[PDB]
Design a protein around this ligand. Structure first.
Ligand code: M5A
Length: 581
């Protein structure tokens, strides 16, 4: 019978350890590494016991519960992690819910800092196993929903970079570009998974199902509806699980799904060839991001099945999900150029037209132009991508982030500074990722990445709500979030923040920051300016940041750093007020 044995045997020891360290780092984000390693040994030992006897030890119990019992075993928790000991005194299947609800999307943690190359390679040389325990633990605690088996994949890429670079001439010059690139992939991965989890948990299984139906219909245009559907069903269970902290099950299930798709690759995509050769993680990663197969030629016009067919209303009425799944499949596989959110928006339009029209005396006369009515929904996002790409190319990264920071702060000034600056910085990454593709490739690139970034604002804001406008964009339809945020003008009801000296007065710590961190400091300041003076002009703002820049250059090459900051700090505070009013 025993679950931990089945799972142990299934994913094998190596992945088993990692998934259990991930599980523990996800539930208990503030515990020291050394504490988590012990919980993992104690759990590994148990599975190698349930390897012997199916009835030998606690092997009868659900995984939810083996994790349950291990946390509360050390009451050391009640103190630094005594908020969720409220959960330890409760029971299943109600307890494990308490645990999951306290996952902190923004734990109070210093940044994961990366050591000098010499030092990082030394740590990896001395103890490799400890090294990647540390890594899984530092990423998973900071991103409590990261897609667990993709995390394993990234650990493995990370080790391949240290192997290549640690013996090198200049270790730094070899590591830095490669780590920085790996880090960016992992952030995007974390943001995509957080979106799946939020769709599932906040808007229901169906909302991710539809999303995954569209995306897989674009990716695998030749595969038939019943196959896509089967893939959509299994991938739903996969992410429902991972999103719920059932990582052993998720990893195992995701493996069967990779296997099933390779074993049936003939009738899915020719591009599956690239993936099916590969060892497990590499294979499932490859699948998970495969570029779109080409559209089969000779498909009938979509109007035949969805406008002229005499059973349109009977289909919609008698089997709604089946019929509208088909609409999504058919429409999406033929539109790799559209974003997922757009396609879902067309689904919603089509459905609302049917609902309304099929309840009239003459449904056909009412819905005949439904596909033609998609045009203005297609044009809004295409226009926006184009205007914003020209702005990106015109201003460059930093000034584009600046313009979005100003626009967003005026939009939702109640939002906290670190969130506004994070969210603006992500918005400017989209310019860089996407505006170099030709016109046709741009929309799915931009709009799908916007989803991920808006979701990130929505999860942060859910924790501590402060803006009615965010809450509204974030909780109405998932698929309208981008248009919803787009349509917000400046919030003219916000009462400007008091002028606040220490949010504007600077100290010598700051001189140690690399230029990239100084940018964030300039950008944090700009946000506080816009909060203080929401009608400030772009020239006003450029002049205050300009002064900030001069203060920094000046006091950062002083021998007496604290005392130049004292002479100049308050002289900035005084020139800011003057420029601003
Ligand atoms: C949702 C938000 C907004 O306008 O408030 C938004 C909308 C569109 C874009 C946009 O089109 C681009 C960003 C980067 C390159 S193009 C950026 C941000």
């Amino acid at each position: 019978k025993s679950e931990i044995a089945h799972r142990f045997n299934d994913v094998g020891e190596e992945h088993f350890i990692g998934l259990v360290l991930i599980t523990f780092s996800q539930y208990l984000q503030k515990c020291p590494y050394e504490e988590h390693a012990k919980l993992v040994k104690e759990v590994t030992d148990l599975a190698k016991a349930c390897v012997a006897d199916e009835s030998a030890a606690n092997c009868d119990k659900s995984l939810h519960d083996i994790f349950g019992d291990k946390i509360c075993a050390l009451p050391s928790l009640r103190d630094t992690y005594g908020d969720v000991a409220d959960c330890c005194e409760k029971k299943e299947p109600e307890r494990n819910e308490c645990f999951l609800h306290h996952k902190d999307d923004k734990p109070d943690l210093p940044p994961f800092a990366r050591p000098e190359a010499d030092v990082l390679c030394k740590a990896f040389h001395d103890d490799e196993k400890a090294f990647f325990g540390h890594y899984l633990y530092e990423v998973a605690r900071r991103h409590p929903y990261f897609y667990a088996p993709e995390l394993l994949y990234y650990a493995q890429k990370y080790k391949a970079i240290l192997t290549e670079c640690c013996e090198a001439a200049d270790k730094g010059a070899c590591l830095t570009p490669k780590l920085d690139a790996l880090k960016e992939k992992a952030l995007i991965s974390a943001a995509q998974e957080r979106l799946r989890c939020a769709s599932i948990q906040k808007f229901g299984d169906r909302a991710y199902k539809a999303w995954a139906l569209v995306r897989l219909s674009q990716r695998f245009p030749k595969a038939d509806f019943t196959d896509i559907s089967k893939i959509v069903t299994d991938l739903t269970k996969v992410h429902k699980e991972c999103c719920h902290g059932d990582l052993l099950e998720c990893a195992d299930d995701r493996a069967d799904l990779a296997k099933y798709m390779c074993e049936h690759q003939e009738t899915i995509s020719s591009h599956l060839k690239e993936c099916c050769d590969k060892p497990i993680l590499e294979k499932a990663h490859c699948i998970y991001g495969l570029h779109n197969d080409e559209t089969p030629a000779g498909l009938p016009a979509v109007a035949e099945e969805f406008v002229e067919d005499k059973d349109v209303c009977k289909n919609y009425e008698e089997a709604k999900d089946l019929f509208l799944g088909k609409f999504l499949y058919e429409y999406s596989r033929r539109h790799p150029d559209y974003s997922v959110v757009l396609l879902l928006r067309l689904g919603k339009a089509y459905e609302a037209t049917l609902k309304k029209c099929c309840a009239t005396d003459d449904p056909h006369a009412c819905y005949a132009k439904v596909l033609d009515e998609f045009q203005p929904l297609v044009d809004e996002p295409k226009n926006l991508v184009k205007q914003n790409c020209e702005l990106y190319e015109q201003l460059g990264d930093y000034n584009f982030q600046n313009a979005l920071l100003v626009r967003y702060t005026k939009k939702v000034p109640q939002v906290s500074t670190p969130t506004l600056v994070e969210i603006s910085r992500s918005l400017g990454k989209v310019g860089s990722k996407c505006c170099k593709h030709p016109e046709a490739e741009r929309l799915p690139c931009v709009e799908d990445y916007l989803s991920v970034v808006l979701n990130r604002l929505c999860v942060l804001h859910e924790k501590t709500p402060v803006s009615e406008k965010v809450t509204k964009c974030c909780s109405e339809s998932l698929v309208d979030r981008r248009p919803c945020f787009s349509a917000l003008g400046p919030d003219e009801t916000y009462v400007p923040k008091e002028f606040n000296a220490e949010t504007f007065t600077f100290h010598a710590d700051i001189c140690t920051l690399p230029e990239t961190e100084r940018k964030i400091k300039k950008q944090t300041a700009l946000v506080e300016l816009v909060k203080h003076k929401p009608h400030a002009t772009n020239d006003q703002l450029k002049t205050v940041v300009g002064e900030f820049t001069a203060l920094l250059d000046k006091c950062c090459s002083a021998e007496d750093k604290e005392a130049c900051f004292a002479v100049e700090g308050p002289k900035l505070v005084e020139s800011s007020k003057a420029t601003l009013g």
